[PDB]
Design a protein around this nucleic acid. Structure first.
Lengths: 282, 159, 91, 168
RNA sequence: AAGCUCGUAUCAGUUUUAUGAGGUAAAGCGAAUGAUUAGAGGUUCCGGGGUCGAAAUGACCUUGACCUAUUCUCAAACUUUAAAUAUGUAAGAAGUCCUUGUUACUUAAUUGAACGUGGACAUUUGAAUGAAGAGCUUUUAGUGGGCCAUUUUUGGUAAGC
RNA sequence: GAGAACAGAAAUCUCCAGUAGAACAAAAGGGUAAAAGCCCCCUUGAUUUUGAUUUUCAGUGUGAAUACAAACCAUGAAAGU
RNA sequence: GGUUGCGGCCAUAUCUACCAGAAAGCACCGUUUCCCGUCCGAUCAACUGUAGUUAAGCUGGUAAGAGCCUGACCGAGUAGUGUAGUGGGUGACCAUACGCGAAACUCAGGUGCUGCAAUCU
């Protein structure tokens, strides 16, 4: 019941906007470069959370399309020992550590700028080495996530800063920030990094309500991983990332063309004009 | 009273377009302007800051200065009996390249290609352009082609 | 007339002089805009003697914040200029 | 089909249209507080009509929304007032249903003569699971037509539970 | 007028190739926007501009607040598409290409930017036609009441207005 | 447009449709939709030093405006502004 | 070839009505101790991929659909317009010569195209 004049005069918005994925008021401030640099691409750490998966990328800008420099996902963590809970706050920290140690390897700034290793959860950012090359500067891109303190997003940022990447950030949206005094609690922040907020809740739900301890946390009981060993999972996991962040891919099966030979069967094809004209004739 | 404001008589010239309202697309910002490039000026209606005056709509200049958001463009404007050399600072939304210059830079590469190729053969460089020549003599075919006779038509109203 | 400011009257103290309009009732008046959250009370003689009671809205010229640029007003004695001139009762 | 295409009782919006503001408005707020168990929010006027006696931004009316399992129990207590009987009206074309009562002392807790007598508007919304897609932020879309709720589907639902009549 | 530096300099009230900008003529009203001439009622759905008031439950006068029902019109101050004439720039030596020098700018980075060394490309060196030379400088007289014609027009009944 | 006690032409509440038919201190013309409108949170960059540039232009003034540089700050998680 | 993340160009991509979708990815979905935010864990926060589903989203198809985009001995070399005449006409305005030359309409065809990184019978 829309008039012909209504569809005649209609500013159809851009393709990424009516699908609802990209803010274009934010993108203009992230993409543009100070024009006296003439070529220098501005690299954006894109951290996107779907459910049951974490996506982290390092991309640049070009008029043809964005160019991916390096990327890692949450489902690569079972290679590094983290099986269950690969979408919590702590696995988000491990993924940001993974992209940083990977992008410093393929670029060349690998041996220097190791970042912090004895991680205690205190706000500091990487410093430039005296009489050496400057560290690699990557800005954060959040998309459409509402910015609240204690989020999963800044955990992926903290893994990027500890890996050695230069990410400009404040200490106020980390968890444990106090409202009245403007300080951060480094002891309480260190809890969230190694899965303390989950392993604490494995205690209270155990004795009080056994009915949900079978339904929830079922992968923990299947492999028999108790609450106090959860902190020892991530500690071995971060050192596993420092060893070999090399990104070997998988085989997937025989080839690629067998995948295309399947997917042709289930999509429908367009009718021709004369086959259409035969249907109008009947 | 008269009216000589900074944006007078610009009702239809600073309008945006039909079905092109809204924010600008991101290949406007990603293009690169080096010093000396030939640019064209078309004022964007939505971005009010750094905006060219109504004279310079449609002119063509040379970039001498590059800064954070803007570029410096020189325009030759006549006044009286003399050209002056006036300078502007336009943000990058209002500016765009000139394709007449861009076709020149790829014709020089073709002109350098033909000279180097003809030197391997050794004669007849033949590099200048020539305008349209009067055509040569040729033979038309009436084979399967009888010349059709026409005649002027009489007058009818059919109004 | 476009410079009138709403005032709210607290009480009326008449001095008993009266030509034809119940002269010189010392009206204790406060601003409409400052009655809510402030404690600021003005104190002024005015010809609006009998027609004014407690809690009435009156209009007035407010000299204490106005920078006039007359040479006649500049050629005065400032410490004899009142802060409030009550003009008319509203409603 | 059947398997997930199911109705539910998403929110219940209590309303009390108080005529003019004052302490009588705040005594109406304590009614909804002891009823819904939550702190009610207050609404301001949009315009000045002056035939009803109201002015703009006056905090004229209160309302409180109840979600979850507690919304069904207040809904059951309201239908007992009108004996599970509704008109041919009261069912919107979108599929939602609402009804207004008066004299809230007939149901509920007590009389309590200090607080007075008040009449409520009950309004109930209905949807299916999967209605998040219109409310969410990222990748916002609209629900397809066969999944939408209708007037005819709600009355067919409302007859089945609670044994009620749309008799008019 | 006095000349000065130089004498093929690259300029030109012009065209062509290429590429910009514009919103008038014409089109459109079954694409948005759209007047006109008139104008009857409904008494706190307002008072706006007044005026008189020992006050406000306060009066009197007026434009009315309100069009409460439909009814046509097209367009200097209405618009999707859009000429003709007129208009901006480019057609190389102050250029292009290899190569590596400079720095306190810039880059994660001898990455970029800008200006250069050394090497290569000359008589078709990068469209047409013309060039009583090209370029710069000093100094001063007169003038600062205009008028007419084809075309486009505004005020006006029209005018040697 | 369809629904809800008193409640009607107009109070408050709910859903669907809604390219701006609203709003943006004011004249008109532009401009703008995860904003340049509405509602919250924090702040004084409405500051210091002087040059270049645009508009009316004699390329003088005056007013208004644009883009920088050196300082010092505001805000934001940040790009930036 | 199908998905997802990030885009480029911004309706051949939108709008309305019905249908189909293995695999995996998405998406609905389950809970409220913690960081956190609301009248309301609906929105955002966190927690589990667990109890369950392709019903929606999403993608693909169909329609002598509405819209939109290309064309054409379509309309039309018509409307307008640059120069020329001691051309016509009381005029209004109209023919000619050398030139440039549209719009609505009519018909025919079309219904997104692609860059990077990953993953899928």
């Amino acid at each position: 019941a829309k008039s012909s004049a209504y569809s005649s005069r209609f500013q159809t918005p851009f393709r990424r906007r009516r699908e609802g994925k990209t803010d274009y008021y934010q993108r203009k401030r992230l993409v543009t470069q100070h024009k006296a640099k003439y070529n220098t691409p501005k690299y954006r750490l894109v951290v996107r959370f779907t459910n049951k998966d974490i996506i982290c990328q390092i991309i640049s800008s070009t008029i043809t399309g964005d160019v991916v420099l390096a990327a890692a996902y949450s489902h690569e963590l079972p290679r590094y020992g983290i099986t269950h809970g690969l979408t919590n706050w702590a696995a988000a920290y491990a993924t940001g550590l993974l992209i940083a140690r990977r992008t410093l390897q393929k670029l060349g700034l690998d041996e220097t700028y190791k970042g912090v290793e004895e991680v205690e959860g205190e706000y500091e950012l990487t410093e430039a080495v005296e009489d050496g090359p400057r560290p690699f500067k990557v800005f954060l891109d959040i998309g459409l996530q509402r910015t609240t303190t204690g989020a999963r997003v800044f955990g992926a940022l903290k893994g990027a800063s500890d890996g050695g990447l230069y990410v400009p950030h404040s200490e106020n949206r980390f968890p444990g920030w106090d409202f009245e005094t403007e300080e951060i609690d480094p002891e309480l922040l260190r809890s969230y990094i190694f899965g303390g907020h989950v392993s604490q809740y494995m205690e209270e739900l155990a004795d009080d309500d056994e009915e949900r301890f079978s339904e929830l946390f079922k992968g923990y009981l299947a492999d028999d991983i108790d609450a106090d060993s959860l902190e020892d999972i991530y500690t071995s996991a971060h050192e596993a990332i420092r060893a070999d962040p090399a990104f070997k891919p998988t085989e997937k099966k025989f080839t690629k063309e067998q995948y295309a030979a399947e997917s042709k069967k289930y999509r429908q094809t367009k009718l021709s004009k004369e086959e259409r004209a035969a249907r109008v004739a009947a | 009273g008269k009216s000589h404001g900074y944006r007078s008589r610009t009702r239809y010239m600073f309008q945006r377009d039909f079905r092109k309202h809204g924010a600008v697309h991101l290949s406007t910002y990603l293009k690169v302007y080096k010093v000396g490039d030939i640019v064209d000026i078309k004022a964007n209606g939505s971005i009010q800051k750094g905006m060219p005056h109504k004279f310079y709509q449609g002119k063509t200049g040379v970039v001498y200065n590059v800064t954070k958001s803007s570029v410096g463009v020189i325009i030759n404007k006549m006044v009286g009996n003399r050209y002056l050399e006036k300078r502007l600072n336009l943000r990058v939304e209002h500016i765009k390249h000139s394709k007449c210059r861009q076709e020149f830079l790829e014709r020089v590469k073709a002109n350098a290609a033909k000279r180097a190729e003809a030197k391997a053969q050794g004669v007849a460089v033949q590099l200048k352009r020539q305008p349209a020549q009067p055509r040569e003599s040729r033979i038309v075919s009436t084979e399967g082609n009888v010349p059709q006779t026409l005649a002027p038509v009489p007058y009818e109203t059919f109004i | 007339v476009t410079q009138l400011v709403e005032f709210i009257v607290l009480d009326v103290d008449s001095t008993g002089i009266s030509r034809g309009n119940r002269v010189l009732a010392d009206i204790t008046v406060a601003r409409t805009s400052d009655l809510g959250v402030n404690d600021q009370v003005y104190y002024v003689r005015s010809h609006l003697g009998g027609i004014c009671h407690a809690g009435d809205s009156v209009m007035g010229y407010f000299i204490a914040n106005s920078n006039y640029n007359s040479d006649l007003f500049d050629g005065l004695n400032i410490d004899y200029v009142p802060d409030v001139v009550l003009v008319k009762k509203l409603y | 089909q059947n398997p997930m295409r199911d109705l539910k009782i998403e929110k219940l919006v209590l309303n009390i249209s108080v005529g003019e503001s004052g302490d009588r408005l705040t005594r109406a707020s304590k009614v909804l507080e002891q009823l819904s168990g939550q702190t009610p929010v207050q609404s301001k006027a949009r315009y000045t009509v002056r035939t009803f006696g109201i002015r703009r931004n006056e905090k004229i009316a209160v309302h409180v929304t109840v979600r979850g399992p507690k919304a069904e129990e207040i809904l059951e207590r309201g239908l007992k007032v009108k004996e599970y009987q509704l008109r041919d009206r009261n069912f919107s074309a979108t599929g939602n249903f609402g009804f207004g009562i008066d004299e809230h002392i007939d149901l509920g807790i007590k009389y309590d003569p200090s607080i007075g007598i008040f009449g409520m508007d009950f309004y109930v919304v209905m949807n299916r699971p999967g209605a998040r897609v219109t409310r969410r932020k990222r990748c916002k879309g609209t629900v397809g037509n066969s999944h939408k709720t209708t007037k005819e589907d709600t009355v067919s639902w409302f007859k089945q539970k609670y044994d009620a009549d749309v008799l008019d």
